Design a protein around this ligand. Structure first.
Ligand SMILES: Nc1ncnc2c1ncn2[C@@H]1O[C@H](COP(=O)(O)OP(=O)(O)OP(=O)(O)O)[C@@H](O)[C@H]1O
Ligand SMILES: Nc1ncnc2c1ncn2[C@@H]1O[C@H](COP(=O)(O)OP(=O)(O)OP(=O)(O)O)[C@@H](O)[C@H]1O
Ligand SMILES: [Mg+2]
Ligand SMILES: [Mg+2]
Ligand SMILES: [Zn+2]
Lengths: 436, 633
């Protein structure tokens, strides 16, 4: 049948150490445990996310080493395998959840009403725990500073590329540096599905751990055990638990591509409160778990043993107003004096000359009055500046440079691409094949 | 069974007979071991050795014959013995968290003489199946790298033990076995739920490349043929399209071949593939003798003249163009500047001239002598064929991009012939590549910027049959001004009738046409066929071409000169003198001439193997550009 192999890791001692770390850990630098404070904060319906730090876990390991008792190197176990430790930590959080200390505040929560209505009928006359959960659990990659402080090296936070991601890193926690190109809308993904049964017993719950599932449509309760054909199950959306899901694509930076090659791309999946952290056009450093997609359905047979892949995201590090500060900056620049000439001159300091052109580009940067006259008359305040002249006079640096100053600007060129008049009403977007 | 163990014993004896392989195993092992111990690191060598078939031939003729003739029954026994030896060497323990599950077995590679097993994608037939072969060719297409599952590990609750399932495929192993459905087990033998534990399983990278025959060796009236090679593990991404490669592997059949439930048909045959063991590129490593000779030849005063004259010794004259080509070979230093800009370091040359003036025989020479070169013809090219094309990946199913001529020659040269005969829609694309050195693709949901840093040498003809001196230069050349501004040196060459020139050039041509290759008799036709013997062993003064290639490589990779003030003083005076004069030049002078002087000075500085730009470099650049623009020679 299925042969058996011996592996050093045992999850019992790991669970014991997680339980010890949640209670014992204190920030050495409020007093007391670091995480039981934020758990109490969560219990008051205020915090929606729980973020664990592996620097903190190393701190607990270092405390135990100061005591001298052996440890299970939890930090390495998390790095090598992280899809199971999420469930372990969720169970550990569920076991030690503090009581609501203040402001219970039950107002109109449908799930709350359902759960409260369950109690009376069940007691007067076991469900999946994830239904009662609200917090989301995320890991935080290691820090080189803390690592160098205690050696031990580091692998999870190293800024790899899309190309350096081999098949040997699957099932681990890694970090990838790139630029975000495409981001999709937020849609709900089912986690626990509740079916209502023709006043037969009560609603049944099923968990979904894949991208594809099958409805139950058969009532198995004790009262529903009667033989008469009676009807299948109907889904109830209100008693079911959903989640926010988003998918993005990250592309390799031009600096890291070798000569003669084409850049690759990677897929990122994000669930929870971390959704909407990434937008198109951002250069970011994303940490997560690298997992194999099932690739099932059609065109799975031809591949046979070939799989897709994706990255479950858990952390985001983006590389890069009226206040008294900006109220004083303008006064400082006024006291500086020579605003006109200096403003014109500092525009593209590489190019020497054409100072009147630089004066006019300033006037183009500012806008004239747009006054809406009655009876339909309108007058424009925008500026139309054309610059003619012989080739090789710095024609096309001046322009590009002006685009930098104003955020709202587009550099459109000749017939290589059609963007000036592309006010088209048809868009064959591959995702859905409908017009936009 | 017994034969397997006997062959393992034979290979084990072979391994301790020759101690070199045992030393290489230890070197790789100690490197990998002491690399992981460097916590303050500044990467991992694969488990693969290269053995020579020759030594095995003297050791055991039977085993060598078995490997060459019946690889599928002699390679797996050898790999197990190599793994056993490697395991015996590693005395130090490695109680790693997850390396215990994945052993990464050692593999083998071959070299030496293959005899009659050295073939090409055309001479490979059904007689060579299940044999060890080597094929020479050019890579055309590659597939995307995907991960493939080899072993899955599952954890069982209520018991605490693990269970593993193994997977095999036709392309994975050399022996046919019962296939696997690649579905993860969900139920234990006792019915306990099983949970898949990624991070303990095994995945291997997989790629497929296509190797085509060299078009120069094809028979008359026939198109070149191609074959498919599958690469795995550590052989991935060692080749790129356009490369010339030699792949050693096992020629194998696959599938059912229409002898099955499907209808009987004469059009259905079997599918053939190669499981590549080794890939060899057909970078010239330099010894100390070569470097010492280069440094000794650098100090000679008239080195630029010798280097320029050594180019194309079968062309009479055209000294200045040959100097310009040499300066192209040793490009300038590229400067990365703020605002996301870069000053180009490439030198671009255009040649306009009369018919039969040896314009096209210099492009062909540049194709051969340079490290990377791509040939293009005006009328037989398209815009989508120069920048990139949207295609599909059959093996995996996505939509991808395929490189064109310009982007395939990154850090190389592109030689375009009949440049004026190119259509306008075609000529816009080359404009962008000449200006930004980048390609923008915004088609079919693929939004990408591609790097293309190539040097352009081009040849064209005037509007009429021959150059006219009684008409303005712009009337003679049909090319637009915007395109014409992007060339550093424009050379107008004219054939003038003179008796002494004719007497010399006719003598030179007649001397050239009377050359006999060594080993050929008079009247014996040249047998440019090689008789299917592709290779014997499978892996005033002028200078020889390979020495020139070594010189160019060393100069490009070892010296980066910087500009100096005293050279700038010469450059500025030359620019000011040239700008303010009434001489009628064949091309207008603009503010981009200064950059051309700087680039030519940098190239001449590289030629001298020096780290600074001197006054002599500025003088040489000035003389070259004065000849180009004026003809004052
Ligand atoms: N006043 C100036 N100051 C500095 N550089 C200048 C000046 N005038 C021209 N240049 C030079 O001109 C170049 C910038 O303009 P460039 O010739 O590339 O484009 P353009 O004027 O749009 O012409 P084209 O028609 O060739 O595209 C640089 O080499 C720059 O050094
Ligand atoms: N200077 C020369 N030295 C040696 N051979 C020459 C020379 N000039 C021309 N030839 C010979 O003339 C023939 C044609 O030359 P080639 O094809 O290079 O001309 P071209 O400039 O490309 O012509 P076209 O304008 O017709 O395209 C070749 O056989 C070449 O060897
Ligand atoms: Mg311009
Ligand atoms: Mg020609
Ligand atoms: Zn019922």
């Amino acid at each position: 049948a299925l042969p058996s192999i011996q592996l050093p890791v045992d999850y019992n001692n790991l669970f014991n150490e997680i339980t010890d770390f949640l209670v014992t850990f204190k920030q050495d630098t409020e007093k007391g445990p670091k995480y039981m404070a934020m758990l109490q904060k969560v219990a008051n319906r205020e915090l929606n996310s729980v973020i664990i730090d592996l620097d903190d876990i190393l701190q607990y390991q270092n405390e135990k080493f100061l005591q001298g008792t052996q440890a299970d190197d939890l930090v390495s176990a998390i790095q090598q395998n992280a899809n199971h430790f999420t469930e372990l930590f969720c169970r550990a959080i569920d076991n030690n959840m503090p009581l609501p200390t203040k402001e219970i505040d039950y107002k109109d929560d449908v799930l709350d009403v359902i759960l409260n209505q369950r109690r009376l009928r069940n007691e007067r006359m076991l469900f999946p725990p994830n239904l009662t959960r609200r917090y989301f659990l995320y890991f935080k990659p290691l820090s080189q500073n803390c690592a160098r402080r205690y050696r031990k090296k580091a692998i999870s936070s190293k800024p790899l590329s899309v190309r350096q991601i081999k098949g040997d890193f699957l099932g681990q926690l890694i970090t990838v540096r790139g630029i975000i190109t495409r981001v999709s809308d937020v849609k709900p993904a089912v986690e626990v599905i509740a079916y209502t049964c023709d006043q037969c017993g009560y609603e049944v719950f099923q968990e979904v751990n894949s991208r594809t599932f099958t409805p139950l449509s058969e009532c198995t309760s004790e009262e529903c055990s009667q033989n008469q054909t009676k009807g299948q199950l109907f889904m109830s959306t209100r008693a079911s638990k959903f989640s926010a899901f988003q998918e993005c694509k990250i592309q390799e930076l031009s600096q890291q591509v070798p000569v003669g090659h084409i850049p690759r791309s990677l897929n990122i999946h994000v669930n929870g409160t971390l959704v909407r952290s990434l937008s198109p056009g951002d250069i970011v450093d994303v940490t997560g778990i690298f997992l194999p997609a099932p690739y099932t359905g059609f065109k799975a047979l031809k591949a046979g043993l070939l799989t897709e892949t994706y990255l479950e995201a858990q952390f985001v590090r983006q590389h890069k107003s009226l206040t008294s500060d900006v109220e004083e900056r303008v006064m400082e620049l006024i006291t500086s004096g020579d605003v006109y000439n200096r403003l014109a001159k500092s525009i593209a300091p590489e190019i020497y000359g054409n100072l009147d052109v630089k004066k006019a580009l300033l006037l183009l940067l500012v806008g004239g009055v747009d006054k809406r006259v009655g009876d339909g008359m309108k007058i424009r305040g925008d500026i139309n500046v054309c610059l003619m002249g012989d080739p090789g006079v710095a024609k096309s640096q001046l322009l590009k440079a002006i685009c930098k100053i104003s955020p709202r600007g587009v550099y459109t060129t000749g017939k290589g691409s059609s963007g000036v008049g592309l006010t088209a009403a048809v868009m064959k977007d591959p995702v859905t094949d409908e017009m936009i | 069974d017994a034969v397997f163990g006997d062959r393992v014993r034979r290979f084990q004896e072979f391994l301790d007979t020759f101690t070199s392989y045992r030393d290489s195993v230890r070197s790789i092992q100690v490197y990998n071991s002491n690399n992981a111990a460097n916590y303050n690191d500044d990467n991992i060598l694969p488990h693969r050795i290269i053995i020579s078939l020759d030594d095995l031939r003297e050791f055991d003729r039977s085993f060598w014959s078995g490997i060459l003739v019946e690889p599928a029954y002699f390679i797996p026994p050898a790999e197990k013995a190599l793994t056993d030896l490697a395991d015996s060497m590693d005395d130090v323990p490695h109680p790693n968290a997850s390396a215990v599950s994945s052993r990464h077995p050692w593999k083998l590679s071959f070299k030496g003489s293959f005899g009659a097993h050295a073939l090409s994608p055309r001479t490979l037939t059904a007689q060579h199946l299940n044999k060890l072969v080597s094929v020479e060719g050019i890579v055309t297409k590659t597939s995307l790298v995907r991960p493939k599952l080899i072993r899955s590990v599952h954890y069982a609750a209520k018991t605490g033990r693990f269970h593993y399932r193994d997977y095999t495929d036709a392309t994975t192993t050399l022996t046919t076995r019962i296939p696997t459905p690649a579905i993860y087990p969900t139920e234990d033998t006792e019915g306990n739920k099983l949970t898949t534990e990624y991070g303990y399983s095994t995945f291997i990278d997989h790629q497929r490349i296509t190797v085509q025959e060299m078009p120069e060796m094809a028979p008359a009236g026939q198109l070149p043929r191609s074959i498919d090679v599958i690469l795995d593990d550590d052989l991935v991404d060692k080749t790129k399209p356009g490369d010339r490669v030699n792949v050693v592997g096992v020629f194998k059949s696959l599938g059912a071949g229409g002898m099955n439930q499907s209808n009987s048909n004469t059009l259905i045959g079997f599918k053939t593939l190669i499981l590549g063991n080794t890939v060899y590129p057909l970078r010239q490593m330099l010894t100390d003798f070569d470097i010492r000779n280069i440094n000794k030849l650098s100090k000679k005063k008239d080195i630029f003249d010798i280097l320029s004259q050594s180019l194309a010794p079968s062309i009479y004259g055209h000294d200045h163009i040959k100097k310009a080509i040499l300066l192209m070979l040793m490009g300038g230093v590229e400067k990365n500047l703020e605002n996301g800009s870069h000053l180009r370091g490439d030198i671009n040359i255009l040649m306009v001239g009369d018919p039969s003036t040896a314009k096209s025989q210099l492009l062909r020479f540049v194709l051969n002598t340079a490290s990377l070169a791509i040939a293009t013809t005006g009328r037989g090219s398209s815009g989508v064929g120069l920048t990139a094309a949207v295609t599909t990946d059959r093996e995996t199913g996505e939509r991808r991009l395929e490189a064109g001529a310009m982007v395939l020659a990154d850090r190389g040269v592109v030689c375009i012939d009949e440049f004026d005969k190119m259509t306008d829609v075609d000529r816009v694309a080359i404009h962008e590549v000449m200006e930004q050195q980048t390609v923008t693709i915004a088609k079919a949901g693929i939004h990408t910027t591609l790097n293309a840093r190539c040097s352009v040498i081009a040849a064209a003809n005037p509007v009429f049959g021959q150059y006219d001196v009684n008409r303005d230069p712009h009337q003679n050349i049909a090319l637009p001004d915007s395109l014409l501004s992007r060339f550093d040196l424009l050379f107008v060459v004219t054939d003038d009738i003179n008796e002494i020139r004719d007497r010399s050039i006719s003598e030179h041509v007649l001397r050239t046409h009377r050359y006999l290759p060594p080993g050929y008799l008079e009247g014996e036709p040249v047998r440019e066929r090689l008789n299917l013997s592709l290779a014997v062993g499978e892996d005033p003064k002028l200078v020889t071409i390979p020495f020139l290639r070594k010189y160019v490589q060393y100069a490009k990779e070892r010296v980066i000169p910087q500009l100096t003030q005293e050279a700038i003083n010469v450059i500025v005076k030359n620019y000011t003198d040239l700008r303010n004069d009434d001489n009628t030049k064949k091309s207008p002078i603009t503010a981009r001439t200064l950059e051309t002087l700087i680039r030519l000075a940098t190239a001449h500085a590289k030629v001298r193997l020096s780290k600074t730009v001197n006054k002599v470099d500025a003088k040489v650049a000035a003389n070259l550009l004065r000849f180009a623009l004026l003809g004052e020679d």
